[PDB]
Design a protein around this ligand. Structure first.
Ligand SMILES: Cc1nc2cnc3c(c2n1[C@@H]1CCC[C@@H](O)C1)CC=N3
Length: 291
């Protein structure tokens, strides 16, 4: 008889599925090593009216898929929104036009006083506490990974190194560590590549320092540390860092930072993880300073 085709089923539209043919690149937002994030417009009508989105791709497939599964199931006002995927696979996120603290703080000093800084600090802590409650370690908390939604709101905006801590275990052991942000890392991470929730508290301390210096490049943790230890030690750098930290030396108080803010910061940097403050205690500390 007649050619037998297949009865077409009712094709619903998934709002989390972005078609590659309509995803149009505008510019690069950031990158390094294995992955990159690009600003695109998803423009299915082809008239330049479509939504702008942040697209994370690979320059490692399984890592990105894990990252996508983590972000997709995180819901918090201080965590960047998952929008969908393009399938190889690309992670589609909301685009925050003010960028990260790295871009925004140098340009908005007149706008952002100590009060607004402590409010960001509180919001970064709330996000991180949420992540910790879901049994995750972030491993990459730095100002460049903190996005500005508005003058009054920040969100944690990249989860590429985030790992799950096994239930009834205190830490995660890392193998791939070539490209570690060592000037943000707690001693136990540098020495044994173990990562506690308290190690994120340490990194938070260093992120708070960056906030307080408005992410000035000449006051960056890397810059300040390389002054403390020496900028020309090559592969001996990390060991000299570990050594300086053992001796009890820490980043200095930022200019115009009240001692009471600086002490909250120093509690992030107790050498022993069990001696460090928690995110909830940081929150309480900042809120007491705020009112
Ligand atoms: C610099 C920057 N601007 C962003 C706007 N929206 C975003 C993201 C943005 N980023 C960085 C991209 C690379 C990783 C992070 O440093 C953030 C990321 C996600 N949405």
């Amino acid at each position: 008889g007649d050619i037998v085709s297949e009865k077409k089923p009712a094709t619903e539209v998934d709002p989390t599925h972005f078609e590659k043919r309509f995803l149009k690149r505008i510019r690069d937002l950031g990158e390094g090593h294995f992955g990159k994030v690009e600003l695109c417009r998803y423009d299915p009508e082809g008239d330049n009216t479509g939504e702008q989105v942040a697209v994370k791709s690979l320059k490692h497939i399984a890592d990105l898929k894990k990252e996508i599964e983590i972000l997709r199931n995180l819901y918090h006002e201080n965590i960047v929104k998952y929008k969908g995927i393009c399938t190889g696979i690309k992670l589609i996120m909301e685009f925050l036009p003010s960028g990260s603290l790295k871009e925004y703080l140098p340009k908005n000093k007149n706008k952002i006083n100590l009060k607004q800084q402590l409010k960001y600090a509180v919001q970064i802590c709330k996000g991180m506490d949420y992540l910790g409650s879901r049994q995750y370690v972030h491993r990459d908390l730095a100002a460049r990974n903190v996005l500005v939604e508005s003058e009054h709101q920040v969100k944690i905006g990249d989860f590429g190194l985030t790992k799950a801590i096994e239930t009834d275990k205190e830490y995660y052991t890392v193998k791939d560590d070539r490209d570690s942000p060592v000037f943000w890392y707690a001693p136990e991470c540098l020495m044994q590549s173990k990562f506690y929730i308290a190690s994120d508290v340490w990194s938070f301390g260093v992120t708070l320092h960056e906030l307080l210096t408005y992410c000035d490049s000449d006051s960056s943790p890397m810059a300040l540390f390389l002054k403390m230890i020496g900028p020309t030690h090559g592969q001996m750098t990390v060991t000299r860092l570990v050594n300086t930290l053992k001796e009890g030396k820490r980043l200095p108080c930022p200019p115009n930072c009240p001692d009471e803010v600086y002490q909250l910061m120093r509690k992030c940097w107790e050498f022993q993880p069990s001696n460090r403050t928690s995110f909830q205690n940081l929150i309480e500390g900042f809120e007491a300073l705020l009112k």
